[PDB]
Amino acid sequence: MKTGIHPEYVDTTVQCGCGHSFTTRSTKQSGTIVVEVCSQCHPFYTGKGRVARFEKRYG
């Protein structure tokens, strides 16, 4: 790893609105990333006709 050329890589904490936390590395110098959605509360990750319309009108 060449000394000066890279952006600094810092220990970061990621926190989510669903409360899920996990520690990782990141380029964010603040060392904290707040995020609205994650793998754990994305609906995709979790799994979350004309005749019928006719009968809603007239039955």
Partner 1 sequence: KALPRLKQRYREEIREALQQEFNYANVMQIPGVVKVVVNMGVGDAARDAKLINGAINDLALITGQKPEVRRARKSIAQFKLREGMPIGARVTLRGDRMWEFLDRLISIALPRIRDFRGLSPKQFDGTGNYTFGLNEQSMFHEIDVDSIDRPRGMDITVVTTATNDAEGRALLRALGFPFKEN
**Which parts are annotated binding residues for Zn(2+)?**
16, 18, 38, 41
Q: CB of 19: closest distance to partner 1 in angstroms?
A: 14
- List beta partners, residue 33: 14
Q: CB of 32: closest distance to Zn ion in angstroms?
A: 16
7 binds, among Zn ion, partner 1, none (CB under 5 to 8 A by kind): partner 1
Of 20 and 25, nearer to Zn ion (C-beta) is 20
Task: Reduce the secondary structure of 15-57 to three states and give it as a string.
Answer: EECCCCEEEEEECCCCCEEEECCCCCCCHHHHCCCHHHHHHHH
14 binds partner 1 (CB under 8 A): yes
Reference 21, options 9, 7, 38; nearest CA is: 38
